[model samples]
Target: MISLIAALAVDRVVGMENAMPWNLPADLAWFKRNTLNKPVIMGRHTWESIGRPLPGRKNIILSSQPGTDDRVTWVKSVDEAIAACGDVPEIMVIGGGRVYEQFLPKAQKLYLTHIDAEVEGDTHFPDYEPDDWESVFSEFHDADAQNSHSYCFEILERR
Candidate 1:
């Protein structure tokens, strides 16, 4: 299943100056564990921001300029990205904003990390009406030594 996984703010701002400004270690570990060994589909900017391939998972970057990443598979479009995955049990659509917006309609599951804090930003998550999906699970974690603010881990299924 395809999933849109990301963390956003009250203003829906995802990053400032093309980079995620906030620090959330808990969120990072969660992303790693959940998307481990799965096919990860992302935009070029997101791929660049991360700077390296996440070991164990097949990485597909959806950029108009395909074959740009010699080490990782790069596709020209969202559909091509899905095709490259080719029957993977789970497809994780990791992104910035454009990729997420384009792929959300096809994503079957969503893994979102809701942060309590907000930061000024450029990229943002797409807004959706509540009726668009079903919330299957949610877990809240209090602020700790790692995470700066209280956050919630939510898994939702598209209806």
Candidate 2:
């Protein structure tokens, strides 16, 4: 399965300066539960934003310069990364805006945390047609001590 995972505000805003606008611990846990140990493909900027390769998953970064470390695999394009992970049953496209936009059309599933409030974000998640997808699972969460906003974790499969 090829999955695109993200948390976005109501207006599709994702982040500013390559960082999440809000913290939702439960959402983070949900993200981990979905993508953990899966082959993860991300853009160079996204890789940089994390500052290191994620443990327990194959890290493929899209960039002109191939990464130097053994933990990371650098590819110039998303297709190349997918091809490199061909034997894997699942590949998680974790990203910055451009990377998500490139993979959203090709992804078989989407794991999204829909935030109730909107913010002025410099980076945004690309909009997709809801009619073209079906929601398979959903869990709603209200703002709490750890979470800054009300949100819903939703899994959608492309139709």
Candidate 3:
């Protein structure tokens, strides 16, 4: 199975300077909970933004050039990334904008956190038709001291 995960603003903005625009520990915790021990594919910019390999999961970076780290498997395309996952039950595409766009059509599931506010950003999540997916789960999280904006956690399966 192929899955895509991301947190985007009302405008579908995912990043503003190679980093998340909001500070939501709850969302981060949710991300960690879902992606732990999974084979995750990301683009070069995503890898660079993260600065290092995510612990407890196989990191697959989709890039034209090879990375120096032995911990990361570099692939040139989506097919190569999927091949690298081998027999894994699910491959998670956790990304920057471009990587998400590349995998959206092929992904079977979507783990999305929708933030309430719109913000300035250079990169945005790819557009997808709502009718193409069915929401399997959804939960709303209100803003707190640590979380700056109200957000909704939604899990959608391809319909």
Predicted structure with the largest TM-score when compared to the true one: 3
Compute the lDDT of residue 37 as modeled in candidate 1. Answer: 85
Worst 10 residues of 2 by lDDT: 15-24
**lDDT by residue for model 1 over 1-159, one digit each (tens)?**
788888876687776775555667888899999999899988888888899998999999877764666889988877788899998788998888998899888878888888887677778888766898899999998888877788789998888
Q: Is candidate 1 or 3 superior in TM-score?
A: 3
Q: All models: lDDT?
A: 0.84, 0.85, 0.90
The segments of candidate 3 whose C-alpha lies over 4 angstroms from its true place after superposition are none
lDDT of 3 by residue, 1-159 (tens): 999999989789898875666789999999999999999999988888888989999999988987777878999988989999999888999988899999999989999999998788988889989889999999998999999999999999998
Give the deviation of candidate 2 from the true structure as CA RMSD.
1.4
Worst 10 residues of 3 by lDDT: 14-23
Q: List the residue pairs that clash in candidate 3.
A: none
Per-model TM values vs. the true structure: 0.94, 0.93, 0.96
User: How many clashing pairs in candidate 3?
Assistant: 0
* Model 2 / residue 73 / CA error / Å: 0.5
**Model 2 TM-score, all chains together:** 0.93
Q: Pick the candidate with the highest lDDT.
A: 3
Backbone clashes (count) for model 2: 0
